[PDB]
Amino acid sequence: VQQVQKKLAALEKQSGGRLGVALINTADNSQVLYRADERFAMCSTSKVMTAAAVLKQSETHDGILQQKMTIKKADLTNWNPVTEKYVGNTMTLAELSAATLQYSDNTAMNKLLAHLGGPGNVTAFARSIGDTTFRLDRKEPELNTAIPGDERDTTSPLAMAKSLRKLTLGDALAGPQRAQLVDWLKGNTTGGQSIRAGLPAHWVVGDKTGACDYGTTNDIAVIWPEDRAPLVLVTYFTQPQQDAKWRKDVLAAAAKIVTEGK
Numbered sequence: 001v002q003q004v005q006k007k008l009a010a011l012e013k014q015s016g017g018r019l020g021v022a023l024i025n026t027a028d029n030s031q032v033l034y035r036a037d038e039r040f041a042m043c044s045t046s047k048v049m050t051a052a053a054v055l056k057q058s059e060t061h062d063g064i065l066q067q068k069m070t071i072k073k074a075d076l077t078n079w080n081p082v083t084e085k086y087v088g089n090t091m092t093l094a095e096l097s098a099a100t101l102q103y104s105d106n107t108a109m110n111k112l113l114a115h116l117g118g119p120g121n122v123t124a125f126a127r128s129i130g131d132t133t134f135r136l137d138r139k140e141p142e143l144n145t146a147i148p149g150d151e152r153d154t155t156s157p158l159a160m161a162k163s164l165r166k167l168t169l170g171d172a173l174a175g176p177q178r179a180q181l182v183d184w185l186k187g188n189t190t191g192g193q194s195i196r197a198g199l200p201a202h203w204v205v206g207d208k209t210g211a212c213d214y215g216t217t218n219d220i221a222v223i224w225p226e227d228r229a230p231l232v233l234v235t236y237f238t239q240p241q242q243d244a245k246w247r248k249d250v251l252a253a254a255a256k257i258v259t260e261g262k
């Protein structure tokens with residue numbers, strides 16, 4: 001059905017930006033692709049691979065998720081909805097992971113990066129699960145420049161869709177860790193206006209949004225349409241002006257377009 005292709009193409013043209021979509025239907029492994037092999041800056045969506053790297057460690061290191069880290073007034077970044085509540089005290093890695101994933105807390109992200117030894121370690125983890133496109137280069141907030149043509153902190157919609165699938169439904173993570181990642185993605189509190197907005201209200205969704213410079217507005221999610229096989233969806237969107245406004249409505253439209261009737 002190229003109807004979807006035409007609709008996506010029109011959506012992009014009308015938006016005046018560059019749209020990236022990758023949908024994987026686990027029912028038969030069919031895919032809906034639109035610039036699925038092009039690179040897009042990930043913004044907060046890179047936080048999923050990051051949190052997953054920590055979960056991977058917990059498979060061998062027992063109780064690591066309960067390990068504590070101190071939050072100093074110096075760790076605070078441009079967005080600390082949760083961490084700012086702990087300046088002077090501690091947060092476990094689980095709490096930190098939850099904070100970065102569900103509230104997109106930047107301080108929490110850098111705390112996880114520090115724990116992992118830097119962005120290069122997240123990239124290594126991605127490679128270990130077969131993702132040869134993903135690449136994390138900087139920490140928060142520099143990783144959000146999203147400069148057109150810059151390959152730093154980018155990935156493709158398809159590569160991210162495959163990795164999200166491997167992580168949440170596949171074998172990239174062990175049972176317990178897989179369940180925690182899914183639980184965290186379902187508990188996201190910032191996706192209300194994105195992919196979720198374009199889906200029937202009773203469908204169950206796990207997702208991670210993101211928004212940064214050049215009006216880059218992203219979202220990656222796993223969708224369970226009632227009792228049907230899960231859908232893995234990545235909607236990436238970026239614009240020409242560095243100061244462009246975010247277009248969460250564009251991702252919602254894209255989501256409706258590709259998931260309608262699934």
Ligand SMILES: *C(=O)[C@@H]([C@@H]1NC(C(=O)O)=C(S[C@@H]2CN[C@@H](C(=O)N(C)C)C2)[C@@H]1C)[C@@H](C)O
Pocket residue numbers: 042043044045079104106140141144190191208209210211212
């Ligand atoms: C990540 O991409 C940045 C971070 N992540 C997200 C996100 O939704 O994933 C938010 S955007 C959110 C809606 N717009 C802002 C505002 O409306 N609030 C005050 C409610 C927050 C945030 C931009 C991170 C890299 O900085």
